[PDB]
Amino acid sequence: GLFVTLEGPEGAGKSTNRDYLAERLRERGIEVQLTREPGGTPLAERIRELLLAPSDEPMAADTELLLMFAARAQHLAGVIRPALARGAVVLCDRFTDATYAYQGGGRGLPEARIAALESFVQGDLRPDLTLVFDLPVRLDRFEQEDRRFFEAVRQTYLQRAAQAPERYQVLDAGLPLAEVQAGLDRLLPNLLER
Numbered sequence: 786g787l788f789v790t791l792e793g794p795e796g797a798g799k800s801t802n803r804d805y806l807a808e809r810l811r812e813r814g815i816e817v818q819l820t821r822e823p824g825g826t827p828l829a830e831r832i833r834e835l836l837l838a839p840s841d842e843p844m845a846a847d848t849e850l851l852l853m854f855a856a857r858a859q860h861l862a863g864v865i866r867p868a869l870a871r872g873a874v875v876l877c878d879r880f881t882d883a884t885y886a887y888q889g890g891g892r893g894l895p896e897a898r899i900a901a902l903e904s905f906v907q908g909d910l911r912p913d914l915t916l917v918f919d920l921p922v923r924l925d926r927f928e929q930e931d932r933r934f935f936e937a938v939r940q941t942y943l944q945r946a947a948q949a950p951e952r953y954q955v956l957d958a959g960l961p962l963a964e965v966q967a968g969l970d971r972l973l974p975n976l977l978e979r
């Protein structure tokens with residue numbers, strides 16, 4: 786199978802582009818499983834609910850990081866690994882790069898602490914390809930965040946893509962839809978090969 790993750794803020798056309806990619810693969814007779822993080826299983830979605838619900842009690846940054854990984858551990862065992870084992874293409878909306886971006890960049894948690902959790906929870910599993918939807922910068926907890934938080938998120942994704950170029954493709958989400966999809970179209974041949 787192939788593990789593809791999609792990263793980027795809301796409003797960047799990630800969902801419609803994920804559907805587009807799913808259709809181009811399914812039309813070629815490839816099995817595709819769509820999923821998202823945090824979430825993807827009943828327990829993981831209950832965890833997503835705690836992470837998104839605003840509350841008068843502030844959530845510690847360490848709590849936010851640990852809940853993101855707890856949901857990841859469940860989703861990996863329940864959905865992602867089984868899907869990859871069937872030979873499916875998994876198209877996952879957000880994954881550990883979001884942890885580096887939101888919790889590392891956004892919240893200030895050390896990169897090494899995130900890396901240690903990534904290694905614990907995932908073993909050697911990493912996405913085969915990560916599509917970064919780059920976009921210049923009742924509300925849920927992340928929606929409530931300010932411009933600075935989101936600029937840190939944006940730049941973190943870009944830094945990560947630059948560190949491991951072989952695994953990422955940065956798309957300019959500010960461009961028209963048709964333009965972004967043509968980029969996906971051009972990306973398809975390598976995918977069908979990978």
Ligand SMILES: Cn1c(=O)[nH]c2ncc(-c3cccc(C(N)=O)c3)cc21
Pocket residue numbers: 794795822823853854879880881883884885887888927928
């Ligand atoms: C998967 N993942 C992670 O590891 N750390 C994360 N932080 C935030 C989101 C997230 C989820 C829904 C919406 C938004 C948002 N509105 O920006 C962010 C997703 C994350």
